[model samples]
Every structure is written in C-alpha cells, then in structure tokens.
Target: FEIPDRYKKPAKMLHEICIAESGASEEQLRTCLDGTVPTAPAAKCYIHCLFDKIDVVDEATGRILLDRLLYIIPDDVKAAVDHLTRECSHIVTPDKCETAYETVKCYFNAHDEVIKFCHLLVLE
Candidate 1:
C-alpha cells in the first residue's frame, strides 16, 4: 500500500515496530511487501501497527474509524466495507502477541467479512 502523503513518519515507525517484533531487518520486510501481505506474529503484529498507526483502529476508542476509513478503501467496496468495518470496530488486543495480534485479527475479520459476503469476486 502506498504510504499516503503525511503518513511518512508513522509509516517508518511501523517499520521499526515490525523489525523489533519480527527480528527481521528493514531490508527483508521491504523486499517482501514491496512485492506484498502476513503470517507469523511479527508480520501480523506489524499489520496491527499499521492499522493502529494510521488511526484506522482508534486506540483511544478501541474501535475502527468509519469515515476515516472511507477515504482510503477501494472505491468499489464502500457499502459492504462500511458495514463490515462498523461491526468490526472493536479491536481486541491480545496477550503474547508481537504487539497487537487481535487487532490484526479484527482487521482481517473485517476484510474477510466484506470479501466473503459482498461477492466482490472482481474489482473494477
């Protein structure tokens, strides 16, 4: 994902958070996602950092942003995405995570929900 302008620092912060958690060098993460996605707690936690950093998942409110999200979501998935995000608002911060695995799970849950239920088999 293009690190939209104004998010440059936070983007870098997430990289540090990921490296600290994953023990992988910045070069490795870059080489991979500079191709693409996640698995191990480190990577998953890295994803959580991203959502957390971007304020997509409100750390204070413990809920995902609705309007804030609309700005960056793929244009085609608005309705479905809206519904899913609304319901997925609650971010679960789990123990033993690299940083925030449950939060990442919540994000995936929303993404999966939208894709699974929306019949978005294709994007235009």
Candidate 2:
C-alpha cells in the first residue's frame, strides 16, 4: 500500500466520523494540521474521533492513556510522546475534545524534527 494508502481504513473511518459528527470537510483536514487548539466543532470532533479509534484516550478516565498509546507508536518516536504529554497535558482538565485534538497537534509540533510518524496496524 502507498503511504497515503497506509492505514487507509482507520483514516477513512475517522474521516467519515469527523464529517458526520462535526461536518469537517476534506479541505478542513488540512487546517486540522495547523497546530490549532480545535475551538471549532469540526476540528474538535476530528481529533476526538481519531483518539477514540486508537483507544489512546480513556473514555472512563477522560484522559490520555500513555500505555495504550505506546502500543501503536514506534520506538523511534516514543520520546516524542513525552513532549506531547508535557506540552498538552493541561488539555486534560476540561474541553475534552480539545485535549485529544491539541495533544495530536502538539505531538506533530514538538517532535524532534519537522517530519512526523505513526505506527498503524490491525486490531485485537
């Protein structure tokens, strides 16, 4: 599969849910990558929809579960997640949607380099 095709199923599901739950459009997805805090409903739902599918944010705890997240992140990028937590952990207090959204945006923003990465795969 192509890099664009990589994890396409999960990507498609999140895309559908984001559109259905928040009416985010394809063009809007580009904006989601703008390191914004997701004040808008579409961007909020887009990130929430993403974390839920990955099982990274705990619905019960209403916070990010690092252990669960590690399952999907590669060793090369594990350190990046620490930055996500340090910078974005404050989002955990309220605005549940923005927490997920900003953490992801933060992950991309604070990584060691300009490049980004994710470990995608099948489920249990």
- Give the best candidate by TM-score: 2
Across 4-120, the per-residue lDDT of candidate 1 in tens digits comes to: 345445445566665675565444333232223344545555555555656765565444465586777555557755665575655444342433445334544555532221111
RMSD of 2: 5.6
Best by lDDT: 2
Off by over 4 Å in 1: 1-39, 72-74, 94-100, 106-124
- Cα deviation at 120, candidate 2, in Å, is 11
What candidate 2 gets wrong by more than 4 Å, as runs, is 1-5, 33-38, 72-75, 112-124
Candidate 1: residue 56 lDDT (0-100): 67
Cα lDDT of model 2 by residue, 1-124, tens digit:
1234555576666656656776766565554344343456676676676677677777864576655666765445456566666766555747667676666666566652432223221110
Error of 1 at 38 (Å): 5.7
Per-candidate Cα lDDT values, in order, are 0.47, 0.57
Error at 22, model 2, angstroms: 2.9
